[PDB]
Design a protein around this ligand. Sequence first.
Ligand SMILES: Nc1ncnc2c1ncn2[C@@H]1O[C@H](COP(=O)(O)OP(=O)(O)O)[C@@H](O)[C@H]1O
Ligand SMILES: Nc1ncnc2c1ncn2[C@@H]1O[C@H](COP(=O)(O)OP(=O)(O)O)[C@@H](O)[C@H]1O
Ligand SMILES: Nc1ncnc2c1ncn2[C@@H]1O[C@H](COP(=O)(O)OP(=O)(O)O)[C@@H](O)[C@H]1O
Lengths: 375, 70, 303
Amino acid sequence: KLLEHKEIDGRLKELREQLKELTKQYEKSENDLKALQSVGQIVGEVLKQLTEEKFIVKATNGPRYVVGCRRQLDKSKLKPGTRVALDMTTLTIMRYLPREVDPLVYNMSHEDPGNVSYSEIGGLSEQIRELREVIELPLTNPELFQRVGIIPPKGCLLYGPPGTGKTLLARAVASQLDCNFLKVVSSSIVDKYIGESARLIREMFNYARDHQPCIIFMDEIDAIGGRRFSEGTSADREIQRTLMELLNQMDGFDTLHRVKMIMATNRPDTLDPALLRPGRLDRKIHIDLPNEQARLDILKIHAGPITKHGEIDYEAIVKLSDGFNGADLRNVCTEAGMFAIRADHDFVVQEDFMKAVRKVADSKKLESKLDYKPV
Amino acid sequence: CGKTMLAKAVAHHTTAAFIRVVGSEFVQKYLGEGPRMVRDVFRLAKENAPAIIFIDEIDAIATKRFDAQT
Amino acid sequence: RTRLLDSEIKIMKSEVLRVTHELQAMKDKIKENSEKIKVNKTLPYLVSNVIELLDVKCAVIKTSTRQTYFLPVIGLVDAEKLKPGDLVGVNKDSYLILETLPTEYDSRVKAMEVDERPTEQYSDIGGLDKQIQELVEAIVLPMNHKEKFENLGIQPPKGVLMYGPPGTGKTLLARACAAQTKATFLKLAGPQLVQMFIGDGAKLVRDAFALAKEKAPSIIFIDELDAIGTKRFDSEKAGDREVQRTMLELLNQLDGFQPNTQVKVIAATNRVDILDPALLRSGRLDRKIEFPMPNEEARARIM
Ligand SMILES: Nc1ncnc2c1ncn2[C@@H]1O[C@H](COP(=O)(O)OP(=O)(O)O)[C@@H](O)[C@H]1O
Ligand SMILES: Nc1ncnc2c1ncn2[C@@H]1O[C@H](COP(=O)(O)OP(=O)(O)O)[C@@H](O)[C@H]1O
Ligand SMILES: Nc1ncnc2c1ncn2[C@@H]1O[C@H](COP(=O)(O)OP(=O)(O)O)[C@@H](O)[C@H]1O
């Protein structure tokens, strides 16, 4: 007799349940349906405020217009250069917004994820410490810098033979420090649209200028690095300006604050006099080919994760290994590794080493001129 | 040798209207923005009063070896 | 029999619930589809690269017409779907985003793909077996065997570099890999990357360097690096900026910030000198590989 409550509730529970399950779908989707009529809103910066309601605004997508405000927008807030939402017919303020950052400031900002700390590398606690002091300290320990009477450092530029450990430094720094490093390969900045490289640079320093403290790390500047002429293609003119755009910001009138800059290059022989100069670049950081010590020191770091019978010829490998850069050594491991995988010996030895080493130092003959000091 | 300092000094002690316009800003993504500014800075200069228009790095604007076609 | 009719009466009243929602279904089930087709059905789509994804549910976008419109209704398109630089359907009238689009990728770049796929086996060749091993040994293995490398703690060589006479035979080796390496062959000419618009070389490289990163695995072949490969002087008066930067750009791609072992890069050059000295190194292209003009038997072998 009591089986009915189920047959009542059985129907009921499901029934009463499946009711809202399917009813909610209408609400969510309906929002999506309704929001359809809804509509775009022009953007622009206020050029100025003619009257409280009368505004001179240059469409962010073109020419200037006389327009008014809305009401509760805050005629007080509306100010020169303020980016505002604008109307597509009424053509008035649809709602003021903040200072964007384009779709390029993200890739160099929130994107570029550094790797392991600084310990990962080394061979010359020279720049590691030297950069750190200039760069890190002048932020968390600058409060006393003034007690000596010296502005924090300005900029630091690596410059060394291709493979001295430069690109690996920017990674180590942004990984450990962590704050607001925005990496600019100084190449993808170039576009083709008159001053399309001026806006990128402005946003870079603007974002950062506001977002500071921020680390600016430019990979290969030899691009915008340039040098000027007298002259070259009509193209070069674009870069220059752009090459200058930064120069004027790094110094010029408005004074960089909190936001610091790491300059990157292989060959500093190419760079413009007006860039290397303090007020723009403080002290240059050289990264020479690891010493026999530096090699050995770096050699045990890349070959450290390798299966090697009690025969590791570290003093032998490093020895024959001269003029070998930091990757010329890594390659040395990787090379031997191919001998390792090679024929068949899951476990490397002192044989698949030297063979590589010379092998690795053999083809190194195809690399004329690998040094270039600045000024 | 200290030219950008000289402008900072003048904008400091100064008294008129120091316009700091960079020659690298004049060229935009538009076909008339440049003149439209100069007419502005120059227009604004007339309005302000004895004003200092200052152009840091006029190279970005004036570089002789022009090339009409690009 | 009361509770029967009592739990019986419930059924129709129960049924109402489901039966009535089937009304409530069709009600919106039609208007949902209805207006959506009219607004979405609009096959005109003005793609617009997102910029800032303000969550104060707001978000601005710049059109393929180069027009920025702050839409306060991201419309059809989840946040995640949202991020800068991302193709979007935008109803022309409304600038309401309809669809998300795949992604940018140069029509000049796509031509770097390989449908016909060569057919040169190896026996086609002769005398090149030394490096043919190497050729294989630097790509196929590292591709079809990444668990073996670490089981010896190593790393796989980052791509190779072919050099030597200009008639020995290297383009076949590519051809060989192209037909063999089931991976998506990425053949590209060094000249192509050479462009006019101050920003085609870097863009294309990125474009090509990305297209590969989204089809792993891939062997990008680069005939004559010299095209884009050449030391960078330091003059006054004039001097190649593009060919340099593009190299630089390229350089900054192969290695540099952010590493990648998803793409294999194989470049031949009839002359391994002019090439700048930041392309060889050992990280960029791991293995320097000679193609010696052959002996005789090999000659006997080729003939
Ligand atoms: N001091 C070092 N310690 C460890 N690895 C190094 C070192 N120097 C170079 N390498 C190897 O080379 C890479 C760094 O190259 P990088 O310094 O970016 O060259 P470039 O200066 O031409 O950009 C690292 O991934 C690492 O494998
Ligand atoms: N006599 C001086 N008095 C004060 N500062 C000087 C003097 N000479 C050089 N400097 C310093 O050198 C820098 C000069 O920068 P500036 O001449 O503006 O370079 P640029 O010409 O590239 O703009 C300033 O930071 C300034 O402090
Ligand atoms: N070992 C070989 N066996 C057969 N043909 C070869 C061999 N080496 C080179 N060739 C010939 O060389 C041609 C390709 O020349 P290649 O070396 O690719 O020019 P480049 O080196 O300037 O790209 C092919 O037509 C092929 O017949």
